[PDB]
């Protein structure tokens, strides 16, 4: 099952096995299995060519895994060439969405740099 | 007129009626087994009646509002004993040895000033 990238998930319920691939999560998984008419309590055992390519076509109706990555990259390049406040915080590693820079921003700032 | 005891316990209030029929359960039109007769502390309604023959000797009818599960259960526990002025006062010696006549005074305590939960002095 070389679908959507390198992931061959196995022995999972498909409702989580579709979250297992980058760029696709829970609600998208539920909608894909509804559009393919697949029960939630199935396993990846006994899977066929139809059960590959119907899933891949229904997810190829969606933005996945390569162009999403370079879309994030192109948004970041657009903000850096913009030189906005948010672009400056993206380029210098500071929390963008209205946080406090003073205390406890270590997800964005990394570990403590003395 | 019907043999009645009110009974109340920890923000609950029951209404307990006794006929001399059979000891099966109607609660807000529901089974004991459909309220907690399978679940936790199932025989807290049965416990005062255990001291005599109780199985099918008297009909019982309870309408309760207020509190939670054990609040209503303790309200029943007190309401049955409250309604036990039907037969006599003179079965209640071993009932006082059980102490079930005692109206509960273990009321909850208020949130006080400068504290988080009612006795909780915060850390410093």
């Amino acid at each position: 099952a070389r679908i959507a990238g390198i992931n061959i998930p196995d022995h999972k319920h498909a409702v989580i096995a579709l979250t297992s691939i980058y760029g696709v999560g829970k609600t998208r998984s539920k909608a894909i299995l509804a559009a393919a008419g697949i029960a939630e309590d199935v396993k990846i055992s006994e899977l066929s060519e139809g059960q590959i390519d119907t899933l891949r076509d229904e997810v190829a109706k969606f933005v996945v895994e390569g162009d999403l990555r370079r879309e994030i990259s192109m948004s970041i390049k657009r903000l850096m060439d913009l030189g906005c406040y948010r672009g400056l915080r993206h380029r210098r590693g500071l929390p963008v969405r209205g946080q406090r820079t003073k205390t406890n921003a270590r997800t964005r700032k990394g570990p403590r740099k003395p | 007129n019907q043999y009645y005891g009110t009974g109340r316990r920890k923000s609950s209030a029951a209404r307990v009626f006794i006929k001399p029929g059979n000891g099966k359960i109607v609660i807000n039109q529901r089974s004991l087994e459909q309220y907690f007769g399978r679940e936790t502390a199932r025989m807290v309604v049965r416990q005062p009646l255990e001291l005599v023959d109780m199985v099918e000797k008297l009909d019982l009818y309870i309408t309760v509002k207020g509190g939670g599960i054990s609040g209503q259960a303790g309200a029943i526990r007190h309401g049955i004993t409250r309604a036990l002025m039907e037969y006599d006062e003179s079965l209640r010696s071993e009932l006082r040895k059980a102490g079930f006549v005692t109206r509960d005074a273990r009321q909850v305590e208020r949130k006080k000033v400068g504290l988080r939960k009612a006795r909780r002095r915060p850390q410093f």
């Binding site: 657009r78 060439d81 913009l82 030189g83 906005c84 406040y85 948010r86 400056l88 | -």
Partner: protein, 79 residues
């Protein structure tokens, strides 16, 4: 993400848009306001954003679609 149904723009900046477009690149454009949203008619303009004491000469590029003035001009000198 914001500004539900019709954005909010500025009176005098809106006027100075036509005061520069219909009358040529006289000066850089001077506003004490940092609010209005960039529309593609504004391409080719030197405007000024005041940061607290000082103006920055903002030029507008094509990909400034839903973007904002003070979002282009931060107001904190660092280090």
């Amino acid at each position: 993400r914001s500004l539900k149904k019709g954005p909010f723009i500025d009176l005098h900046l809106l006027k100075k848009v036509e005061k520069a477009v219909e009358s040529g690149d006289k000066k850089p454009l001077r506003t004490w306001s940092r609010r209005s949203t960039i529309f593609p008619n504004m391409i080719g303009l030197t405007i000024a954003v005041h940061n607290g004491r000082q103006h920055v000469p903002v030029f507008v590029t094509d990909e400034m679609v839903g973007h904002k003035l003070g979002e282009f001009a931060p107001t904190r000198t660092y280090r």
